[PDB]
Swiss-Prot record, chain A:
SUPFAM superfamilies: Metallo-hydrolase/oxidoreductase. One of its GO terms (molecular function) is phosphoribosyl 1,2-cyclic phosphate phosphodiesterase activity. Homodimer. This is Phosphoribosyl 1,2-cyclic phosphate phosphodiesterase. Binds 2 manganese ions per subunit. Mn(2+) 1 binds at residues 75, 77, 142, 163. Keywords: Hydrolase, Manganese, Metal-binding, Zinc. It catalyses: alpha-D-ribose 1,2-cyclic phosphate 5-phosphate + H2O = alpha-D-ribose 1,5-bisphosphate + H(+). The sequence shown is that of strains K12 and B. Catalyzes the hydrolysis of the cyclic ribose-phosphate to form alpha-D-ribose 1,5-bisphosphate. Mn(2+) 2 binds at residues 79-80, 163, 221.
Length: 249, 250
């Protein structure tokens, strides 16, 4: 069995953005269901649990040491690893952290890892196994060394693709060739005429799925500007917006 | 009116420590008043508000841009600045951040400060004014460039001294000569046979105050091991343990 929960669907700024009173941020202050925490997920394959990224600040309250099997990191920007900082001082057995071979990490995680074991680095396009789940690292287009991941079982294929601006050629072809049934994709911005540089806008996501043809694209890493746009514009069939806590089967 | 609220009184590990079943951690789970969030304070002087350190993760819920006057930072360890990372992307006027002239900061705060203005670096023993509050930076003994602060108004004096081990000579002498009525001091550790390197134990605090002679020392940055010790052992007169939400007046 393969399930995926989106625990956070925002970017670093979040929704509401601090001090902002735009339509999306004001709504999220009034109704918590519309809040967006840092982009992160939970994957459950049978009994085995993987935490994708660690930008949430309350992991120590959601989980106890030993209650999940590993972290899987996309990259070392603060909004994807800030939740590791207090966890590392816990009491328990070592916790494997799988991720890209970023040689610097973030602040002093690598020098003072506590119970976190960052030795589990992975390689582009080289499949590795997490309790039987087949995971393929996919290089993304981002200011840090950043991997997305294909998650595969006998019957299911899900892609986790944040943070990215467009996709590198080989990654794009890989996804077209290994069509995911579900793609969770960075779409920080509303439709733009050009670019952007570090994250996709909606036009870029539409262009990418013209190639990949995933039947279910779930947008994440949503900025408050995109949320405001979504309050007044519909998405095309086959696209939906993620929300914090969304469960995917 | 000068008042100080301790919004967090723990170290990086916190109380409860993640996964720990010791008596102090179990107590904090059962009785949340005993939880200890990252070492931080809120100073209110007349109308003005200063946030001392920024390790709390819920600042955006507690405050809005412009609802306080400035941040005052002791140092750039994560447990003292992690709360700044989401806030910087906010909407509003620039927010002054006063602190030591650490050339690196933490991660990409300096490169991408957003609405935070880190240009307000301060100097050892050089007084600066925060809406009438007289503040003196005091070098501490710690693995990062770290300042504590004397806060003074109308001959009322409060020292904020975390994180530190034994105090540098000049700082110790300055405090003896400017005896604070209240000192909030790093005491991460229960009493030890040897002074620890980056944070005081109780014996070091006792030794320091035998020189400074402040009549009221409030211990903070408290580890779960020290809480466990405090559950079975009393502090000497003139020393008390801080707690999250503690209110201090002068
Ligand atoms: O810090 V980012 O979520 O714009 O790569
Ligand atoms: O991260 V510390 O509170 O031991 O300086
Ligand atoms: Mn991000
Ligand atoms: Mn990023
Ligand atoms: Mn500290
Ligand atoms: Mn420190
Ligand atoms: Zn907004
Ligand atoms: Zn404990």
């Amino acid at each position: 069995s393969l399930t995926l929960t989106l625990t956070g669907t925002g970017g670093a700024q979040g929704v509401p953005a601090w001090g902002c009173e735009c339509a999306a941020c004001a709504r999220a202050r009034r109704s918590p269901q519309y809040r967006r925490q840092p982009c992160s997920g939970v994957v459950k394959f049978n009994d085995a649990i993987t935490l994708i990224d660690a930008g949430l600040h309350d992991l120590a309250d959601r989980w106890s040491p030993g209650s999940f099997q590993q972290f899987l990191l996309t990259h070392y920007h603060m909004d994807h690893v800030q939740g590791l900082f207090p966890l590392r001082w816990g009491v328990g057995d070592p916790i494997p952290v799988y991720g890209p071979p970023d040689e610097q990490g973030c602040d002093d995680l690598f020098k003072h890892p506590g119970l976190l074991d960052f030795s589990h680095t992975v390689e582009p396009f080289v499949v590795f196994d997490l309790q039987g789940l087949q995971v393929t690292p996919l290089p993304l287009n981002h200011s840090k060394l950043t991997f997305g991941y294909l998650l595969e079982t006998a019957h299911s294929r899900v892609a986790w693709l944040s943070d990215t601006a467009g996709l590198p050629e080989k990654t794009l072809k890989f996804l077209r060739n290994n069509q995911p049934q579900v793609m969770v994709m960075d779409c920080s911005h509303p439709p733009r005429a050009d670019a952007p540089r570090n994250h996709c806008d909606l036009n870029t996501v539409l262009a990418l799925n013209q190639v990949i043809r995933s039947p279910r694209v779930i947008l994440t890493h949503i900025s408050h500007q995109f949320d405001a746009w979504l309050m007044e514009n519909a998405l095309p069939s086959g696209f939906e917006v993620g929300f914090d806590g969304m469960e995917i089967g």
